[PDB]
Write a protein that binds this ligand. Structure first.
Ligand SMILES: Nc1ncnc2c1ncn2[C@@H]1O[C@H](COP(=O)(O)OP(=O)(O)OP(=O)(O)O)[C@@H](O)[C@H]1O
Ligand SMILES: [Mg+2]
Lengths: 71, 906, 385, 54, 50
């Protein structure tokens, strides 16, 4: 037997289109938003600590996970 | 055209369009043959310059491109830029257009990318000398007539904007960035910029705003001062200079977010302070939120003068303009001390002089009596409130009141609101107190309580110059143990003092707001009053006000109705700030209860303002969340749940309101679109949600003060006959009140039709009746705005009692509040030294034409209007001062300000 | 540079958000309901067949029937039944019929027709609050009649007079009578009807008097309104053809127009605008004064008026330092406002001719002489001299 | 030409976005004709429509 | 869909129910067929020199 419910995947699909589109739309305003923002983060915190912000975090590059299994 | 040799000079130019002789060949061969022939090259530089100029008049890109192509090679291949240091360095003068010929003239992507980096480098290195600046400059002011020069100097300037921005992003900074190989520091590019700035403000404007904002420093802004202060008298007049400074300030409100703005308004203040419009100095001082700055402009005019002169008079006028009354406090007292004139000065600073001028308008206007005076049931209750609602502002209705029959015939909580409505008859007038004193000392406590509210409303007319403080009278009542009486006393006291945080007033409200353990639904007024007081200056975001709402939840959480009204009061306190309001979202979120979470979403709307385009995407995330959560799951409590939901809906709209006034002003029109389709979504979505949104529309438009008020009230209205909560009608009318019988013509009939036509409940009805009478004013007697008026970037301060009632299901209790609606625009008449009580002329333009300013500047021509009228709200929302045609000159700018004018005639 | 960025700051974020908002909401509308309204819809679709033949409702007989005239050649006594009410209909409104057996199954039109579509416009006006100068006075006469009742009706009531109905713009070509009406319409923020009077007339007969009715019918639904029937000259006294195929059409169509303008009532809430070349291309009595107030005769700009038109154009083009503002006026003699715009287009083409990026002195001088040469007479000074 | 050139394309995209916005809007309109007192008219409505009588 | 059909879109239909087929951008009028008759423009300025 297969999966015979996909009703709740419509809800996922609807809210996926909302958040992603605004994000794109915002980009023009988003440029200046970053200048405003960085100082208040210095004043407060990044997201929970005042360290691991001596660079961007501590790595220029990024961690991606890629699965090349094909069996 | 083509090869035609050396016969005359014309024909040398035509030859080098195909292949140069004295330019590309000669120099190139010379430099790679010998290194002592560099002295011959030097002379051959001048010869190249004139031939370049001559052939900078040919519109085809190909016959300048290819000709000088190989010069581009030479930069690094033969010259090498270090063989004899100054000499190779200074022969990079022909090579810089040549690079641009491939860049801009030729549009081929590959090459455009590659030579951008190079142009930045060779620019920088050659500006050390300063002859690269001079190279830019011969193109800035031109030496050629064609298309070519009109783009090239512009291309140079963008190069600069690119690099500076890249240093912000990059964490290496200087030329250790790989963007171009270049820095915005050192001694090599900094000096290039310095020279660049000087010239382009003088003649152009193009690179000037990009430098300022990129640095983010008040220093950059202080260079802008030096250049502008020169320009203000010999190159353009005074008037033209005033327009520059405010263009800069109004334009960059949504281009400088809060932390960014504060370092900048400091420079803008200084500009104004030096300048001849001290009116602009003071106006700007309100922005900063700084008391100190307001005080400085006043002290500067008062102290080094020992005479009435222009100086004392102008000071009174500037401070008078805010109906915050914050400026009122500052400005009076120093006048008492100095002892010039008491009689002209103290009154002119305080709200005393606005009473005299209303008298002349009122005399023309008469008093219209169309109100009902029905008796029995709810019809008694309806009629007695409507009577106050139809003679709002200073108007006469005295003889009607003096028959105390219909007044005394009300009962209950209605009785309390009937004594209250009486006070708004004589709103913004010294008198009023007479009618009220009589009721206050006889019968039931209900009628005493109502008196106190009225004294508050009347007392907006005199509460400065140290004369008639509301405090003296209203204190005795706070002391009294009964709840009705004491609540009334402290609400009315806030209204009278307005935005002033006068010490006596403040200090009465400070020990209290900390016992709300006692369950009293009519004890809102404790925090509600303190909120009204706070707004007008930079907000404390006081910890007492935040504490007591939580105490209320400890004692009782069965009666939600009280705890919903409290939550709104905290967010209204925090308006007029945004920097400091980021901290307090965290203070509320510290405690976790489903009830406390209700508090957080309101106050979030106030925190994120002025970068409210982010606020928008968030208030949409809000919509989605009930449904999204539900989806996943498919594959005592009652009070907490209900507060939860409703707060969200309220916030979505509050969020919008705060944003649209402060950043945009033109953009409000578009934002109105954002609202109407938003409102539909919530109205359809939840039923419970639909109630909040119906009332909210009327106040949405009023907060933004729309430029188009024709369509929007009237459309909603028809739909809302079917829709429940007839309070819907009351909220549309509060906006429609405006400029009477333009917005209001359709409205009075439509609202009267629904009540009169069908009675489907005496409950639904009571609202339907109240609405019609409420909009009207007799002969366009005053307008209403949910704005300062002085700034249209601002916000109300006396209008917050109006604003409050839109989260609320309809009730008798609510009626009590609604009697207050103080904050009325004074008519912007012309004054003399020995007082004149009318206008002469004004320009009106329904919609301003300018997009350099959007505050409310239209052209000099306008459409000409006469005297003796209040400030129009539709068809003349911006208002300009007309003088250029009448050979007569105003001293005090007017741009749809609240502000009264003064003119000098010669 | 800085302020065109500010237009971008306001328009990009608010507008881009608005598209996205609509697009999710179309899904979101559906989800609140799942019975009741869904059910009623479901049975509306069972009842109403596919396709539906259009009807036009002539009249309602009060007994659960009506009579329609349809693009099907014989008329029908149809019934009013199923998801429609007796008072959801009004006569003369367009109805939807059932293919098999004609019945009014509801309305989703309500005066939706192609002639309505041409007439209503969602376009932006070309001029807003007299962008181009000249004719200062004439607009302060349109405004008294048209804009002024809409904006403030109260002032007419103190006065005790009835408020005006309509204006007639007429006289000269190239004076921008058709553009002042567009200006006035944007100033108020009224509903504008660009219908053209010439778009009711076709070879085929008997269609026309329907079209005349529909204008007055739609205008009243969306009132307040400003109606512009542009170029009512063609439907004037004149005839279509001297043979055949049009002896009737002009005669019925004009008469039918006067009738429903008067028959409204004497309103000051739906204004009409008749744009016409002259009263010599129309009938000698229209409908005919006290009722059609006011009449505006356009004539040629005078030296003051043509200065004003010119100053607008010259500033939007490179240079004015070369040849004084006054020197342009002086050289020109009095002509319509088109001739003033024409000199500036030709000037710009002449800068292209040279391959300059400046409008030089030479360009102004030639461009002035050209227009004067079209458009010429010399027997004014030949009779004299 | 960077001050006006770049800002020209930006102007253009907004207008096109607005045209697209209007075709998204008009494809859905207000539901339907269904009214509770004429849902009772439906009982008689099936019989007469299928019959030979109009 | 009714998001795929636009205002002023020409379409094909049956005749026994007038049920839609698909979208068409070829709009057929006598003026458009006049372009088919005329064919392509021809000639060059030097053929018509002088
Ligand atoms: N007051 C004004 N309003 C508008 N444009 C004006 C005004 N005065 C003069 N003009 C000038 O007149 C020009 C010609 O206008 P236009 O050709 O549309 O004329 P019209 O009288 O409406 O014509 P038609 O008879 O061709 O329908 C405008 O482009 C403008 O340069
Ligand atoms: Mg015309």
């Amino acid at each position: 037997p297969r999966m015979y419910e996909e009703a709740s995947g419509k809800e996922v699909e609807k809210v996926a289109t909302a958040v992603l589109s605004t994000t794109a739309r915002a980009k023009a305003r988003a440029k200046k938003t970053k200048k405003e923002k960085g100082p208040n983060e210095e004043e407060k915190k990044k997201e929970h600590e005042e360290k691991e912000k001596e660079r961007e975090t501590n790595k220029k590059g990024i961690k991606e996970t890629k699965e090349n299994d094909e069996e | 055209m083509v090869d035609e040799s050396d016969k005359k000079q014309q024909t040398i130019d035509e030859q080098s369009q195909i292949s140069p002789e004295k330019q590309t060949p000669n120099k190139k061969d010379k430099k790679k043959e010998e290194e002592e022939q560099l002295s011959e090259e030097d002379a051959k530089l001048k010869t190249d310059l004139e031939l370049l100029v001559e052939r900078l008049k040919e519109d085809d890109s190909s016959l300048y491109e290819a000709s000088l192509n190989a010069l581009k090679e030479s930069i690094k291949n033969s010259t090498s830029s270090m063989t004899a240091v100054p000499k190779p360095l200074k022969f990079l003068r022909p090579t810089y257009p040549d690079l641009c010929s491939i860049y801009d003239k030729w549009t081929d992507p590959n090459l455009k990318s590659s030579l951008a980096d190079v142009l930045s480098i060779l620019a920088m290195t050659y500006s050390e000398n300063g002859k690269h600046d001079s190279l830019r400059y011969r193109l800035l002011s031109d030496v050629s007539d064609f298309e070519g020069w009109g783009h090239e100097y512009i291309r140079h300037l963008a190069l600069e904007i690119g690099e500076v921005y890249n240093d912000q992003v990059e964490k290496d900074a200087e030329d250790e960035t790989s963007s171009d190989g270049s820095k915005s520091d050192g001694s090599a590019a900094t000096s290039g910029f310095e020279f660049s700035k000087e010239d382009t403000l003088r003649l152009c404007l193009d690179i000037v705003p990009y430098f300022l904002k990129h640095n983010g420093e008040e220093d950059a802004v202080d260079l802008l001062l030096e250049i502008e202060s020169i320009d203000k008298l010999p190159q353009f007049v005074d008037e033209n200079t005033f327009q520059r400074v405010c263009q800069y300030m109004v334009a960059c409100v949504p281009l400088l977010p809060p932390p960014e703005d504060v370092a900048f308004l400091k420079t803008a203040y200084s500009i104004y302070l030096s300048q001849n419009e001290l009116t602009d100095a003071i106006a700007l001082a309100v922005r900063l939120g700084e008391e100190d700055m307001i005080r400085s402009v006043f002290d500067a005019t008062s102290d080094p003068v020992m005479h009435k002169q222009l100086a004392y008079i102008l000071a009174a006028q500037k401070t008078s303009f805010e109906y915050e009354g914050v400026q009122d406090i500052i400005g009076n007292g120093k006048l008492s001390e100095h002892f010039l004139y008491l009689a002209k000065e103290l009154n002119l600073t305080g709200p005393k002089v606005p009473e005299d001028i209303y008298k002349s308008h009122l005399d023309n206007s008469k008093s219209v009596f169309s109100s009902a005076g029905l008796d029995s049931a709810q019809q008694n209750l309806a009629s007695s409130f409507v009577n106050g609602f139809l003679n709002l502002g200073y108007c006469n209705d005295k003889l009607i009141v003096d028959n105390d029959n219909w007044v005394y015939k009300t009962k209950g909580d209605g009785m309390t609101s009937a004594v209250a409505s009486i006070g708004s008859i004589y709103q913004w007038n010294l008198d009023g107190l007479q009618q009220l004193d009589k009721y206050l000392y006889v019968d039931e406590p209900e009628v005493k309580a109502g008196a106190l509210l009225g004294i508050g409303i009347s007392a907006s007319g005199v509460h400065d110059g140290e004369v008639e403080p509301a405090l003296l009278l209203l204190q005795d009542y706070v002391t009294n143990p009964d709840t009705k009486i004491s609540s009334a006393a402290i609400l009315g006291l806030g209204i009278a003092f307005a935005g002033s945080k006068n010490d006596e007033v403040l200090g009465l409200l400070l020990p209290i707001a900390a016992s709300t353990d006692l369950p009293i639904e009519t004890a809102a007024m404790a925090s509600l009053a303190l909120a009204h007081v706070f707004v007008g200056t930079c907000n404390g975001d006081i910890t007492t006000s935040i504490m007591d709402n939580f105490l209320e939840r400890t004692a009782i959480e069965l009666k939600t109705d009280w705890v919903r009204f409290l939550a709104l009061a905290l967010g209204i306190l925090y308006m007029g700030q945004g920097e400091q309001v980021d901290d307090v979202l965290e203070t509320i979120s510290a405690i976790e209860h489903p009830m406390t979470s209700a508090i957080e979403v309101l106050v979030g709307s106030c925190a994120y303002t002025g970068t409210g385009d982010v606020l928008l995407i968030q208030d949409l995330l809000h919509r989605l969340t009930p449904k999204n959560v539900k989806g996943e799951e498919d594959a005592e409590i009652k009070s907490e749940e209900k507060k939860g939901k409703s707060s969200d809906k309220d916030a979505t709209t509050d969020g919008k309101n705060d944003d649209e006034e402060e950043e945009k002003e033109a953009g409000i029109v578009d934002e109105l679109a954002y609202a109407v389709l938003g409102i539909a979504l919530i109205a359809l979505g939840e039923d419970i949600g639909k109630e909040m949104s119906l009332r909210h529309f009327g106040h949405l438009m009023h907060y933004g003060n729309e430029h188009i008020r024709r369509m929007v009230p009237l459309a909603m209205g028809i739909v809302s006959v079917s829709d429940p909560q007839m309070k819907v009608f009351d909220t549309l009318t509060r906006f429609s009140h405006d400029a009477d019988l333009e917005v209001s013509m359709n409205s009075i009939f439509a609202m009267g039709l629904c009540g009169a036509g069908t009675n489907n409940a005496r409950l639904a009805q009571l609202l339907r009746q109240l609405a019609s009478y409420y909009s009207r004013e007799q002969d366009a007697l005053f307008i209403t705005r949910l704005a300062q008026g002085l700034l249209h970037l601002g916000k109300g301060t006396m209008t917050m009692d109006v604003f409050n009632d839109a989260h609320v299901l309809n009730k008798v209790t609510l009626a009590s509040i609604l009697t207050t609606a103080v904050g009325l625009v004074s008519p912007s008449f012309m004054l003399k030294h020995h007082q004149l009580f009318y206008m002469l002329n004004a320009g009106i333009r329904p919609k301003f034409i300018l997009a350099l300013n959007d505050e409310g500047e239209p052209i000099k021509v306008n459409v000409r209007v006469g005297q003796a009228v209040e400030t129009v709200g539709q068809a003349g929302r911006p208002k300009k001062i007309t003088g250029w045609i009448t050979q007569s000159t105003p001293v005090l700018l007017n741009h749809g300000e609240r502000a009264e004018l003064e003119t000098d005639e010669y | 540079t800085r302020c065109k960025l500010k237009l971008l700051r306001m328009e990009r974020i608010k507008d881009h958000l608005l598209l996205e908002e609509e697009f999710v909401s179309n899904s979101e509308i559906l989800k609140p309901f799942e019975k009741k309204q869904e059910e009623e819809k479901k049975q509306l679709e069972e009842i109403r067949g596919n396709p539906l033949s259009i009807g036009t409702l002539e009249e309602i007989i009060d007994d659960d029937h009506a009579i329609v005239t349809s693009p099907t050649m014989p008329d029908y006594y149809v019934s009013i039944l199923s998801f429609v009410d007796k008072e959801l209909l009004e006569p003369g409104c367009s109805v939807l019929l059932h293919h098999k057996t004609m019945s009014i199954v509801g309305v989703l039109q309500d005066d939706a027709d192609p002639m309505v579509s041409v007439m209503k416009m969602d376009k932006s006006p070309t001029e807003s609050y007299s962008d181009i100068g000249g004719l200062e006075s004439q607009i302060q006469e349109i405004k008294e009649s048209v804009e002024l009742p809409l904006t403030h009706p109260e002032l007419y009531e103190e006065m005790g007079i009835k408020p005006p109905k309509g204006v007639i713009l007429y006289g000269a070509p190239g004076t921008g009578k058709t553009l002042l009406a567009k200006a006035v319409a944007n100033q108020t923020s009224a509903t504008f009807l660009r219908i053209v009077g010439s778009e009711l007339i076709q070879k085929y007969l008997g269609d026309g008097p329907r079209l005349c009715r529909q204008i007055f019918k739609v205008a009243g639904e969306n009132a307040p309104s400003i109606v512009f029937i542009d170029e009512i000259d063609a439907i004037g006294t004149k005839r279509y053809d001297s043979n055949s195929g049009g002896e009737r059409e002009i005669q019925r169509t004009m008469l039918e127009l006067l009738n429903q303008l008067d028959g409204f009532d004497d309103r000051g809430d739906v204004k009409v605008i008749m744009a016409t070349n002259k009263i010599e291309t129309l009938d000698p009595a229209l409908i005919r004064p006290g009722r059609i107030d006011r009449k505006i005769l356009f004539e040629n700009p005078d030296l003051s008026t043509k200065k004003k038109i010119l100053g607008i154009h010259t500033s939007k083009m490179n240079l004015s330092e070369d040849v004084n503002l006054e020197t342009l006026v002086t050289t020109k003699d009095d002509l319509s406002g088109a001739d003033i715009q024409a000199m500036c287009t030709e000037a710009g083409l002449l800068a292209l001719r040279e391959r300059r990026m400046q409008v030089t002195a030479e360009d102004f001088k030639q461009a002035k002489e050209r227009v004067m040469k079209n458009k010429v007479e010399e027997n004014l000074e030949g009779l004299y001299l | 030409a960077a001050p006006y050139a770049a800002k020209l394309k930006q102007t253009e995209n907004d207008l096109k976005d607005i045209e697209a916005r209007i075709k998204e809007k008009a494809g859905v309109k207000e539901s339907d004709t269904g009214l509770a007192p004429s849902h009772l008219w439906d009982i008689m409505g099936d019989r007469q429509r299928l019959g030979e009588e109009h | 869909n009714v998001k795929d059909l636009k205002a002023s879109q020409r379409v094909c239909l049956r005749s026994d129910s007038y049920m839609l087929h698909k979208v068409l951008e070829n709009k057929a009028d006598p003026l458009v067929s006049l372009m088919m008759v005329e064919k392509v423009p021809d000639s060059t300025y030097d053929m018509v020199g002088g």
